Amino acid sequence: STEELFNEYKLTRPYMARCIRCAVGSCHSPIAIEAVKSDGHDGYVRLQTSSQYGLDSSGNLKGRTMRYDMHGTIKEIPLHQVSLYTSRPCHIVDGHGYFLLARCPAGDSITMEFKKDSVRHSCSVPYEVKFNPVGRELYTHPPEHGVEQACQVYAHDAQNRGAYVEMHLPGSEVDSSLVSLSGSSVTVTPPDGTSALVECECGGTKISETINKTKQFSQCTKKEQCRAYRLQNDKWVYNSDKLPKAAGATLKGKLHVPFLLADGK
């Protein structure tokens, strides 16, 4: 269990993705869901999210917590604290890195509610949930007793045998919070040990690293003229739909996937 968790967590880089429904209008939610698979016969759903599961924020095997990030700040939450639902409320089985396993009934949409200390933000995705029964006897819910047939459900085993995803070096992220308005200048202060590629739009456009110390931006007094591109690249990131592609970062890496569908009865 340690090997694949370490492989996924050495180059995880949890992110926040664009979400259609943030429970208030639309926003970029750290809990945004990018893919849901509902091919399990019993109703189990295997889906991958921006947030990571199975380890803490320090890269230590801790499966009881959910790990995510907010605006470049990596944060973690207990798994039982955060729950997802559908047409009917679901039940979470387990999570492993990007991918998550849970027991959801049939539904037209997927939503997971993340309630922080004061801020409760949730992301909904219009993905249907196919609750396909087993055999020719159409049950809307698994029966308590009866005969058994061959069944295919997403096993919760963490083994990763014949499937994987590509993880690349993340592209540059814009961060206008780092832009500060000083006297006739902009003082974009990068955080500790962080390279903020400062891009300024005025007469004579300049691009600078300013990794250690902030730089005064002459001719670019207004804050909106200069745009700060945070550049950490501490770990690789999953090749997501919401992330920009760094042209100079051709850093593909295989990441074997958990919760592979397995046959059973």
């Binding site: 970029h28 295919q152 814009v174 206008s176 745009r227 739909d241 992330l243 592979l260 569908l261």
Partner: protein, 98 residues
């Protein structure tokens, strides 16, 4: 099958063209006049000269190894049988090809 879309490539304040690579049913498109928006403000501050490079292809499903349907070419059936023969009070059970 799992649809495979790469991270979009944006040429902020500039022009970019799709590179034709080889993937199953690979499609690449270039989109101009795009103003991307991120959580940390707008990613690109130029209005035009924002070419969007989007490439997508098709990958076989992750669970294809376990769950999948197989097509066969069927012909020339062979016939076999199990016979429990008893001749002369000699109870004999065996398989004999037809």
């Amino acid at each position: 099958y799992k649809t495979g879309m790469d991270s979009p490539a944006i040429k902020c304040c500039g022009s970019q063209e799709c590179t034709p690579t080889y993937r199953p049913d690979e499609q690449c498109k270039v989109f101009t006049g795009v103003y991307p928006f991120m959580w940390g403000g707008a990613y690109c501050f130029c209005d035009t000269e924002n070419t969007q490079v989007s490439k997508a292809y098709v990958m076989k499903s992750d669970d294809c190894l376990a769950d999948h349907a197989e097509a066969y070419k069927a012909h020339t059936a062979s016939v076999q049988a199990f016979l429990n023969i008893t001749v002369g009070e000699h109870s004999i059970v065996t398989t004999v090809y037809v």
